[PDB]
Ligand binder design. Sequence first.
Ligand SMILES: Nc1ncnc2c1ncn2[C@@H]1O[C@H](COP(=O)(O)OP(=O)(O)OP(=O)(O)O)[C@@H](O)[C@H]1O
Ligand SMILES: Nc1ncnc2c1ncn2[C@@H]1O[C@H](COP(=O)(O)OP(=O)(O)OP(=O)(O)O)[C@@H](O)[C@H]1O
Ligand SMILES: Nc1ncnc2c1ncn2[C@@H]1O[C@H](COP(=O)(O)OP(=O)(O)OP(=O)(O)O)[C@@H](O)[C@H]1O
Ligand SMILES: Nc1ncnc2c1ncn2[C@@H]1O[C@H](COP(=O)(O)OP(=O)(O)OP(=O)(O)O)[C@@H](O)[C@H]1O
Ligand SMILES: Nc1ncnc2c1ncn2[C@@H]1O[C@H](COP(=O)(O)OP(=O)(O)O)[C@@H](O)[C@H]1O
Lengths: 578, 367, 379
Amino acid sequence: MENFTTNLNQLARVGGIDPLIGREKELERAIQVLCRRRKNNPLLVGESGVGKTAIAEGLAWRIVQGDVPEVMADCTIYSLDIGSLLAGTKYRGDFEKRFKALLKQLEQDTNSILFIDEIHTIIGAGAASGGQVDAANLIKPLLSSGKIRVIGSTTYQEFSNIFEKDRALARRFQKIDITEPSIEETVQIINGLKPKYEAHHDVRYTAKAVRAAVELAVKYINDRHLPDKAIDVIDEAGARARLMPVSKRKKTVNVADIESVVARIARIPEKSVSQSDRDTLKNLGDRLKMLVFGQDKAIEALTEAIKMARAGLGHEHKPVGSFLFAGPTGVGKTEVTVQLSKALGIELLRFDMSEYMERHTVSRLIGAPPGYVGFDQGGLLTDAVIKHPHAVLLLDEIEKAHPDVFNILLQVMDNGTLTDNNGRKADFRNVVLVMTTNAGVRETERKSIGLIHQDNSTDAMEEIKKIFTPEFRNRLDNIIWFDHLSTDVIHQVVDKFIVELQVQLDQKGVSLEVSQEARNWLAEKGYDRAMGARPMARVIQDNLKKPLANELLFGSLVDGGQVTVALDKEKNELTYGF
Amino acid sequence: AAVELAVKYINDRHLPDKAIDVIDEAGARARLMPVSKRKKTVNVADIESVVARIARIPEKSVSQSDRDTLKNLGDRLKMLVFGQDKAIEALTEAIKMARAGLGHEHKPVGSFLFAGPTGVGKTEVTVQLSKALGIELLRFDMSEYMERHTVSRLIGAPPGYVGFDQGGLLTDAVIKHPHAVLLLDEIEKAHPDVFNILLQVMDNGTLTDNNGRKADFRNVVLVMTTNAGVRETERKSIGLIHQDNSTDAMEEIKKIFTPEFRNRLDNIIWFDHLSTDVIHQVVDKFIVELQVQLDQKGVSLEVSQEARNWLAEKGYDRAMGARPMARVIQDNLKKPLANELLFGSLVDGGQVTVALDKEKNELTYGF
Amino acid sequence: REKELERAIQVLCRRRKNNPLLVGESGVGKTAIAEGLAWRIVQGDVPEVMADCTIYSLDIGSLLAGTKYRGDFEKRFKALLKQLEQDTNSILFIDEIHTIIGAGAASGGQVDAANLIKPLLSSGKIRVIGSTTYQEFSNIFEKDRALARRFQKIDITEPSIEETVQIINGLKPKYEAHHDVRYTAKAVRAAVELAVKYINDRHLPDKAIDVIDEAGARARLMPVSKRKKTVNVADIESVVARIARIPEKSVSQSDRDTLKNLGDRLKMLVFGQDKAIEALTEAIKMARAGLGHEHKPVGSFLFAGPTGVGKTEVTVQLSKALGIELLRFDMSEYMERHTVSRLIGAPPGYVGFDQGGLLTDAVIKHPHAVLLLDEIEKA
Ligand SMILES: Nc1ncnc2c1ncn2[C@@H]1O[C@H](COP(=O)(O)OP(=O)(O)OP(=O)(O)O)[C@@H](O)[C@H]1O
Ligand SMILES: Nc1ncnc2c1ncn2[C@@H]1O[C@H](COP(=O)(O)OP(=O)(O)OP(=O)(O)O)[C@@H](O)[C@H]1O
Ligand SMILES: Nc1ncnc2c1ncn2[C@@H]1O[C@H](COP(=O)(O)OP(=O)(O)OP(=O)(O)O)[C@@H](O)[C@H]1O
Ligand SMILES: Nc1ncnc2c1ncn2[C@@H]1O[C@H](COP(=O)(O)OP(=O)(O)OP(=O)(O)O)[C@@H](O)[C@H]1O
Ligand SMILES: Nc1ncnc2c1ncn2[C@@H]1O[C@H](COP(=O)(O)OP(=O)(O)O)[C@@H](O)[C@H]1O
């Protein structure tokens, strides 16, 4: 007792314990257990960081304050330091000697309570070249006789996995569940605790700041539990605003600072648009339309979803956007998404649904069940989302995956959460789910038989409905049906590819100019409505790169200069030179 | 009473210690009661309260505030889920029979299978029921359980395997919250082999995880939501007259769920589609939620009545239930609102009025 | 890393659980970030709150060395804890935070360095900086809820191109002193860009610097005839090629000749069907001339025609003439849908998982090769 436990009453007398607020029924039942005749040993079990240790030390704090029923008055709770207890037990019997001496001291006191934090650790305290003769059994007979009182604290998992193993020790304690408090209890706890943090960080918290901290930590941080994550938000806000007086920012911590802390912790695009975040969102449709020609309404839908997200009008809990892009090949379905990722400056999560042809490939997405060979790997999808919570999720050619795999995205779109094999949950509320497919293509490109050609516009939707279950479609933000590229779009695509080729050549230090009629001839040569834009890339490659490759590989353009490409009219041929 | 209740509701210790602990805690409680000198005998009510607090289960509460909570539960839910009253009625009656003590022997509070077209309040009624009771909500998306060997994920890996020390998720959750609402979403999309776990649970209210530990489901409401049988109900027959395909819905459900599984259910509540007035109420609900979102930004909003009617007429889709209304309201309101909140008039200001003209059926905006 | 360093400093000055956790992919610079915080403290490039603070890198080996005689490890650990508590101005840096969840005494196996430290961290008594990769974190560290709760998660993200360029600029003098070689700015930028484009198995601030160091080391092995030189873009290209398997600038050698006479060297082996040799040579030339695709295979060709016309022979001869391996797959063996699992592997939890995929592994082992799909109509 001299130097192995710390007097918690002494701490509360010197203010070393943060004050216990609320927890009325919990502490009342802890006292009730303490007042039993036999096995008066309460065990505080609960989630990690919900106030179990807080309750245990707040009992002694209340004793010092005297706001306790007049049966635990003058009782002194001591926190056991197992670490220092085991320090010098090098020789046989030292541990048992010191432990039993402390035990008889506690027996003689008849007023003290021994609080053992993380009591699940005492299932072994030294069997070094020996048997079960450690503290796990030394403490057993004293509890059953009701001579001493011990308070335990452990999480549900550690309890179930370690403490429940020894039924003899397990039955000597009274399990008490410390549940996570609700909103009002948490904000009141913060109200009672924040004087100390204001003192430590030399700041002031507004009431709205505290309420916002509570609500945001609730709806944005799903890693931890309320009474600790809220005060963590508070502490980090205090520290940040305390580091600001380098420019003499002696002021209160308003709501905006709380949102800064929450966004920097949860890695979310918060803190209201502002600065230029507004400029970037404003001309995003432009920066995309200059790289994706035609199919502008897809860019419109994407930008509207992103803005609604940043404007605070997003969904309560859903991905930023859940889009199904369907249309013929080579019309920019994946390109608009990749360019959106590059424009926003965030991560692109590309997944090739063609690799998920079989039903049993779901385990590749979410991980293998426990006990199996691939358990230690987790799942690819959820791991990627957890690593990059703010990103764009691209699922290429979802019609190629097994029709059953869609049921994962079902829950992902509905709730924005996905649980891997470890019970961990990925947060999809900050991702844009975009799925590309060629579903309605073959049905729209059909030939009517009869004297009257029919309207086949609805056939793309018919095919998509036949492929995707009604509940899967019912969770999509919108289905943007892409149309084929028109000839002016083809000219613009040819120009974009010319710019790409020019960049490639500038890398080699040579310049290229292509006459306008040459561009027109290339467009008229390569245009194929049924195949979109890839034939343009092919024809441009064949017509320009191959002659250019020969010219620069074999001397004529080695460290060359200007490439002179123009079109003649008699043969529709191109010119070349240095 | 101490003996009987410690037997029936404590299953972690052995009888000669269970009863002694019940009696000792009752004595300590009656000894702490006389802070106002109420040194009394231990009545049956005190023993019942002690065991209920030990078993973490609800006691007799026909007088407390939760009696009123149960009194107005059906209405406090009907204000959030419009139509489909029979589901709310069944849920509330099951919760009452459990709380009234006139419950099932050792079964869960209620075992209900919710089936019907998508986009209706099958899962939403469950979320709002968990909120209205203030009890934990355990959500399990059975779509993550397509393979038959994912049962190991539910109940844990057998001893002598890599995933043993983690334990099952379902049993661990129920251990953490013995009084909760258990939501199993899209169970027909899980592997049909998984249904046998639910067989065992529904019949006995107990479940043994990998550690031989038994989870107690007697105080957990079991609600499972499916979209099974919907294809037939909405499938058009060929002929001059269409048939009620509800018989086909029943046939499909029986195809998917073995006879004993259907026998271990409290009821199968067939959710209906949403009517037009129900659509109007849904529009009102979503507009209220949008108004809350805007007030978070400091923007008041007023939407006219005929604008509401026009939104409902534009978004009404019988096949998809209430979900299309979300998109309709989204595009028709949030888009101009997002523009005005980002690079427009509604930056730190509100008073946005939306009204419908009759020449173009368009919306008004602005300060 | 001023943003991340500022986040770390903000975390350290907190009242409770003021223990930042540097989480990031390997090679990103987590250990580098901690030791550079120490370095800037030495140079005073810190806010006054962290000034005059001493960071200690905790060694686990020497801490557990010889800790027989139950209590030796505990006594030693508590002695370290007491020295740090008395210092009141020290931060303990644990390079591998996921490795302190076990400290022997498997009998019972509970009183380890993890449970020994939780009271200190929860009380805000001591400041410790951790570091771990993402998978180690999520599979080893975060499993201990109470320990993960006492640490503040900081994501150390992969830097950008220009950030990498500046990092290499700042690190260059040490590599110069080590190799006695000098780097040109164009060479550094080329190293960064080529490492991004062609090296796929590492992350920027550890693979661009890898190219820099290896170029310096090889140019240090050039003065066997005393070829004293600075590192130009050419050496960088050679280095990045030794991993990408195709040099871009070495084409100024006889590689130009091999390209030029390739069509003929094939025509002497494949008679007729000149169109195929022409197409293949044009594709390979466009690739080697830098005009090829930046994210596509060198060439994707479907050869169709009657039997015995040289469809398979021309590809084998092309592989021979180029000196590259022939990744040969017969699509008649993949006549069934489920056979794709041979090419890509089985999902986790299934019998063939640890084997991997045939095609992907063959491609990874041979980054530069010709892929032949015999009888594709049979798959
Ligand atoms: N009633 C309370 N009053 C004030 N703070 C509380 C209360 N309950 C919890 N806390 C906060 O939680 C922290 C203490 O956590 P607690 O001891 O409850 O969990 P724990 O013992 O750390 O759990 P584990 O052993 O799983 O880590 C304190 O920093 C405090 O801010
Ligand atoms: N609107 C467009 N503007 C510019 N380039 C385009 C456009 N549409 C297609 N492309 C070209 O096509 C390539 C990408 O095509 P994309 O991935 O969009 O096709 P897709 O719609 O996915 O068809 P599939 O799924 O069948 O491949 C780009 O390299 C780009 O040059
Ligand atoms: N009765 C209702 N009242 C109000 N809103 C409803 C109702 N039914 C559904 N909704 C809307 O639908 C959303 C919840 O959908 P839910 O999860 O119930 O779909 P579901 O029944 O699972 O369909 P599926 O299983 O086919 O996906 C809520 O956001 C809510 O706005
Ligand atoms: N901020 C930085 N400035 C310059 N170089 C850095 C920086 N961060 C990392 N590096 C480079 O990375 C190397 C050190 O690796 P670092 O400590 O960053 O990660 P690590 O210790 O390898 O991580 P782990 O411990 O997980 O393996 C150094 O050689 C250095 O060149
Ligand atoms: N055009 C050709 N020139 C020279 N040899 C040829 C030609 N076509 C076929 N052969 C010979 O016939 C054999 C079969 O050629 P291959 O291309 O593999 O046939 P397939 O097209 O059926 O795969 C080869 O070994 C090759 O030597």
